[PDB]
Amino acid sequence: SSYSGPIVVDPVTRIEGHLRIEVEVENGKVKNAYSSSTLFRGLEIILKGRDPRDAQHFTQRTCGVCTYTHALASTRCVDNAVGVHIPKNATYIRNLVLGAQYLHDHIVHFYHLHALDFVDVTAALKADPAKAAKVASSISPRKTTAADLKAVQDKLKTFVETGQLGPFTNAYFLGGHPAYYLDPETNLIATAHYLEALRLQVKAARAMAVFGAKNPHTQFTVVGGVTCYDALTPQRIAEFEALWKETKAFVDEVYIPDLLVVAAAYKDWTQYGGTDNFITFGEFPKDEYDLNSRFFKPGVVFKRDFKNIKPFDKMQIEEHVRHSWYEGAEARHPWKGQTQPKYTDLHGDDRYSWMKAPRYMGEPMETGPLAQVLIAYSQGHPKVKAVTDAVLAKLGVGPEALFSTLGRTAARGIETAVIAEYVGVMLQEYKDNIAKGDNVICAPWEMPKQAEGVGFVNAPRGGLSHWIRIEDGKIGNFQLVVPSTWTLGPRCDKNKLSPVEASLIGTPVADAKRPVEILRTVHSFDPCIACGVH
Amino acid sequence: LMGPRRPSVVYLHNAECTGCSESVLRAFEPYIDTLILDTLSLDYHETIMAAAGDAAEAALEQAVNSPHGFIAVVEGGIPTAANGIYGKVANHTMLDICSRILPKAQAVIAYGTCATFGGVQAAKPNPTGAKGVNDALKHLGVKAINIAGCPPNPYNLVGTIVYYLKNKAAPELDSLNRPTMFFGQTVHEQCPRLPHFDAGEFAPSFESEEARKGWCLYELGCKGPVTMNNCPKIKFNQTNWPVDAGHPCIGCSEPDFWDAMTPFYQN
Ligand code: SF4
Ligand code: SF4
Ligand code: F3S
Numbered sequence: 126s127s128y129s130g131p132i133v134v135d136p137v138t139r140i141e142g143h144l145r146i147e148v149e150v151e152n153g154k155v156k157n158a159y160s161s162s163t164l165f166r167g168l169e170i171i172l173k174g175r176d177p178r179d180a181q182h183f184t185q186r187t188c189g190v191c192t193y194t195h196a197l198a199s200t201r202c203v204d205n206a207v208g209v210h211i212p213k214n215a216t217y218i219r220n221l222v223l224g225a226q227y228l229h230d231h232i233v234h235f236y237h238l239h240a241l242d243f244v245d246v247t248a249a250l251k252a253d254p255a256k257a258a259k260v261a262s263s264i265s266p267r268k269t270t271a272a273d274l275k276a277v278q279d280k281l282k283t284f285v286e287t288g289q290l291g292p293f294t295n296a297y298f299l300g301g302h303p304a305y306y307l308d309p310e311t312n313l314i315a316t317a318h319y320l321e322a323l324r325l326q327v328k329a330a331r332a333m334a335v336f337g338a339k340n341p342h343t344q345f346t347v348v349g350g351v352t353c354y355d356a357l358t359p360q361r362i363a364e365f366e367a368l369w370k371e372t373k374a375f376v377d378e379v380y381i382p383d384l385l386v387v388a389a390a391y392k393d394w395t396q397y398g399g400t401d402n403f404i405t406f407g408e409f410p411k412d413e414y415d416l417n418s419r420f421f422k423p424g425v426v427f428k429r430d431f432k433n434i435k436p437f438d439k440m441q442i443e444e445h446v447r448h449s450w451y452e453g454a455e456a457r458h459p460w461k462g463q464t465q466p467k468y469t470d471l472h473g474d475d476r477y478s479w480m481k482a483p484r485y486m487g488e489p490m491e492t493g494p495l496a497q498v499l500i501a502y503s504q505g506h507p508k509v510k511a512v513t514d515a516v517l518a519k520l521g522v523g524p525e526a527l528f529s530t531l532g533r534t535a536a537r538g539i540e541t542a543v544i545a546e547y548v549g550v551m552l553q554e555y556k557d558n559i560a561k562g563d564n565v566i567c568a569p570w571e572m573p574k575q576a577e578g579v580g581f582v583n584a585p586r587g588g589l590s591h592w593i594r595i596e597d598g599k600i601g602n603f604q605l606v607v608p609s610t611w612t613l614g615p616r617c618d619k620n621k622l623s624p625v626e627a628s629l630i631g632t633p634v635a636d637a638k639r640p641v642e643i644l645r646t647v648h649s650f651d652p653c654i655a656c657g658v659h
Numbered sequence: 660l661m662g663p664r665r666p667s668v669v670y671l672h673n674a675e676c677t678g679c680s681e682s683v684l685r686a687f688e689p690y691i692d693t694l695i696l697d698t699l700s701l702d703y704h705e706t707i708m709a710a711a712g713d714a715a716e717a718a719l720e721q722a723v724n725s726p727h728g729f730i731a732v733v734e735g736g737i738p739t740a741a742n743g744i745y746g747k748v749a750n751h752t753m754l755d756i757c758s759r760i761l762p763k764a765q766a767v768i769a770y771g772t773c774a775t776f777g778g779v780q781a782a783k784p785n786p787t788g789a790k791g792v793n794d795a796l797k798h799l800g801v802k803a804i805n806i807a808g809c810p811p812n813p814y815n816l817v818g819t820i821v822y823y824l825k826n827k828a829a830p831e832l833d834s835l836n837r838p839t840m841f842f843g844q845t846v847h848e849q850c851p852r853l854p855h856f857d858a859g860e861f862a863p864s865f866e867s868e869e870a871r872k873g874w875c876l877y878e879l880g881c882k883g884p885v886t887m888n889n890c891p892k893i894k895f896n897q898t899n900w901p902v903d904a905g906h907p908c909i910g911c912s913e914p915d916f917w918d919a920m921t922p923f924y925q926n
């Protein structure tokens with residue numbers, strides 16, 4: 126009782142944007158995969174000829190999930206082009222807002238995008254809330270009572286008995302599903318925390334608005350620094366700090382223990398969705414012109430050879446179009462990029478996506494939390510090592526376990542925990558700098574008529590780069606190369622499967638009508654298709 | 660997904676960045692859990708719904724054809740160039756999807772400047788021929804309530820929905836089909852820096868002592884004077900808004916703003 130034939134998942138839900146996944150299944154396992162991105166907007170085309178100062182406002186709208194990240198990348202890119210060295214406080218404030226973005230983003234991803242692949246919300250109604258409370262209190266320093274969880278169960282019961290299941294309508298778990306493993310009590314704990322996370326994320330996002338004006342789509346960055354003089358005040362710093370502290374507590378006491386209880390129940394998921402190659406750009410600089418000054422450092426690894434981390438050479442990036450809906454077949458370095466749409470329909474002329482296919486030294490590279498964590502680990506990062514080792518020991522698995530869908534999901538949690546703590550360190554450094562009498566947040570600069578620039582962000586989904594060629598003081602070319610482009614773009618002109626495609630090979634599918642296993646792997650990369658395609 | 664009891668909402672995503680969906684998640688008093696468990700029945704939403712693929716498509720059909728009726732909330736512009744092919748879901752163009760579903764709704768709300776007016780992908784040279792919902796579907800008689808902004812204040816969405824549920828009608832709308840209860844004032848007339856404007860006290864640069872002191876941002880491009888929104892009043896995330904963060908308004912609740920308000924740092 127194992128299926129052979131195609132499976133199409135279109136739309137892939139619980140991602141940002143518009144993705145179609147196609148697989149071929151042979152005897153109950155995936156033997157082939159295509160990652161098809163089915164919306165194009167063309168922001169790179171739109172930017173041509175405009176004022177480089179305007180780029181961040183357009184490119185931020187690449188994505189509202191990874192809001193701020195593109196404004197930061199564009200501003201880093203134009204800062205770089207004009208050769209301005211922004212003040213220490215602008216680096217601190219930009220870094221603090223970015224750290225808060227990671228916490229918001231990863232919490233929402235685990236609960237609101239990923240968890241319904243693993244949690245049967247309706248089985249929570251059959252749970253014993255007293256047994257569930259004991260379990261919940263054993264995994265966290267946060268003590269949970271039976272009444273606590275019964276309140277959630279009562280609310281859910283009412284919701285389900287209305288027959289209006291809303292976002293749970295036709296869920297793959299309804300009626301039971303052989304790939305869903307959790308007991309009723311663990312479902313109830315995860316469902317309770319899903320709901321809690323809906324309100325906690327409000328606070329995590331608010332933390333960005335304290336300095337950054339608003340979320341979504343911050344409005345405090347300028348070429349040369351930041352604009353928010355109010356962010357210097359003790360009141361705004363206190364407000365930020367309080368939100369950060371509450372968000373970190375949720376990470377530490379709710380998200381990571383839930384991640385570990387679910388990972389332990391799905392330990393077979395160490396055996397699927399591995400990848401070979403990894404790229405990461407580093408994040409949280411001390412020096413805006415030196416990636417190696419970042420708390421997380423850049424690096425490149427091929428074929429899981431973490432003993433031999435290679436330096437990141439930005440000139441070795443090329444974006445392929447042979448299997449994409451663009452003209453021709455020529456890959457381009459983004460300073461020579463081209464965005465020339467030409468649609469051929471699904472698999473017309475062997476083309477099946479609006480994403481380009483970035484390759485590093487010709488190889489397909491996973492980026493994102495697993496890349497950032499594994500490379501930092503391998504560079505001796507003490508905080509990443511400490512958290513990763515504790516996660517490994519708690520799960521009773523060795524490091525090989527990380528090269529998988531479960532691995533990736535765990536790495537997202539690891540990075541969340543590490544960044545939540547590091548925000549506190551950055552905050553203190555910021556405070557210290559203010560206390561020294563440094564109240565400067567923006568530096569003057571001048572627009573060159575001709576220049577090239579690049580800005581690098583390690584965003585929640587991985588290495589983000591924005592590339593500008595300034596001509597006559599205007600945008601001659603502006604190219605975005607985005608983490609989901611790397612991870613979920615299609616094949617290249619050497620026909621190498623992208624990370625998502627390759628990772629899907631070997632996926633078991635118990636029920637082809639309800640292919641939750643495909644979703645588990647795809648969701649573990651946290652796809653953002655507006656990002657990937659722009 | 661729905662039946663009696665709570666009003667059904669079908670939420671569609673066209674050419675968008677999901678920032679408008681994220682804004683709804685920031686809902687405050689009521690919060691988003693109250694809205695989806697008590698107020699409304701969120702019967703289709705690609706970002707957060709459990710079902711995918713064929714099951715997701717069946718959920719949408721079930722919702723749209725319910726005899727109980729549904730409200731449509733639409734995020735993103737509709738790409739119309741090349742017969743709609745720049746945007747597809749379930750291998751149907753967004754144009755075709757919206758053309759079929761929206762005339763069936765009891766009410767349509769276009770949420771965000773992309774859905775209202777075309778937005779960022781509609782900016783010159785508009786390679787995908789992206790249109791706002793009412794522009795794209797005027798021939799089918801669709802007249803969506805337009806809640807503009809990039810993204811809008813989610814206060815404005817919830818407020819519109821609640822009004823509609825209570826009064827069984829749209830609130831008073833302006834000439835861009837936006838509720839006058841939210842969009843009836845310029846940003847500028849509500850701005851705390853207005854006395855500086857009146858006095859001709861403008862920051863000449865972001866690094867300047869005048870900017871530090873909170874002087875008016877008009878010389879640095881502020882489009883508050885020509886932008887209708889409730890930003891200074893409601894603020895965002897219960898705590899801030901662009902000019903109080905020291906940055907000019909970029910005019911994000913106005914039609915064609917990407918081209919009309921640019922260069923953003925000039926007036
Ligand atoms: S209106 Fe703005 S925030 Fe909303 S979908 Fe469009 S680009 Fe994104
Ligand atoms: S900062 Fe902008 S909205 Fe405020 S007074 Fe000046 S021009 Fe008006
Ligand atoms: S940029 Fe938009 S969010 Fe308000 S302050 Fe201006 S209308």
Ligand SMILES: [Mg+2]
Pocket residue numbers: 169481604605606607658659
């Ligand atoms: Mg690009």
